[PDB]
Design a protein around this ligand. Structure first.
Ligand SMILES: C[C@@H]1O[C@H](O)[C@H](O)[C@H](O)[C@H]1O
Ligand SMILES: C[C@@H]1O[C@H](O)[C@H](O)[C@H](O)[C@H]1O
Ligand code: NI
Ligand code: NI
Lengths: 158, 156
């Protein structure tokens, strides 16, 4: 049987385009996500391909990807989930994000110390902007998501 | 005396920058002024403001103004060109003085507003480089964030 995570269950409203979600059973989605490993190590199985993951790993996941994770030792990761069709800003999302419209040709990247530092700073702010009661929080969140996406594009390597 | 974007911006493409007695002048670009500490005088369109920590001004290009430090006045000017901003944000909706002189140019920020503004402006300062990939886009995204934060926190 399939397990498909639903944006209806993972986003605060129909307007919210991005959220910070943070083992995990095998699943697919109807939204996309960026995965960053903050520390420890473990296993990420993406479309039946196993990756031994560790601090600095970055994955670009499309909705139709099926994946699971397992912590081997002290795994800490973060998933930044987003709905491509909900984004309003005129950044070239598809040009900056593998996995935007279909499975990424190269889903797996790494980040150096500076990229991790800048991602950390942006993601921490993005976590605070989840409130659906604070006026225009969704727009603030999208600007932060834009910064993260550009920073990832700037710092990522294979 | 009129300050010109050609002298104040790193390139034709930079839409926003953090600028480095400042005599009376006008500009061909707009700006936000935030006062961090000390105190002084801001004369805007011939109207004198005693300024200090927490003061925020929205300046339009046509505005004529001068400053004078009374006691170690420390401020920053976030300069921007409306015609250069490429991000599809509702800029004029968030920024008084965007299209013409502001009806209310003078605002204040509390302690939390100031800390968040300072954080973003520090980041925006670090995206001045015209070499680093996506610096101009990052500058606009950060200026977008700044402007929304100021909107959230400012009061008269
Ligand atoms: C939304 C959901 O949240 C979890 O953090 C997990 O990592 C999944 O991969 C993701 O699909
Ligand atoms: C850009 C220019 O440089 C200074 O920062 C000064 O504060 C002026 O007000 C500003 O117009
Ligand atoms: Ni997932
Ligand atoms: Ni000025």
């Amino acid at each position: 049987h399939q397990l498909k995570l639903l944006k209806d269950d993972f986003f605060a409203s129909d307007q919210q385009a991005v959220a910070v979600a943070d083992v995990f059973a095998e699943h697919t989605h109807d939204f996309c996500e960026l995965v960053i490993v903050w520390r420890g190590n473990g296993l990420h199985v993406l479309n039946d391909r196993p990756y031994r993951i560790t601090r600095g790993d970055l994955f670009y996941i499309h909705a139709d990807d099926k994946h699971s994770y397992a912590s081997v030792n002290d795994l800490v990761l973060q998933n930044i989930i987003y709905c491509p069709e909900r984004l309003k800003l005129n950044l070239d999302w598809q040009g900056a994000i593998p996995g935007f419209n279909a499975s990424a040709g190269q889903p797996h990247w790494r980040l150096g110390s500076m990229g991790m530092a800048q991602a950390r700073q942006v993601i921490g702010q993005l976590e605070h902007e989840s409130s659906q009661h604070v006026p225009f929080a969704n727009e603030m969140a999208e600007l932060l998501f834009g910064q993260l996406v550009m920073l990832l594009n700037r710092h990522r390597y294979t």
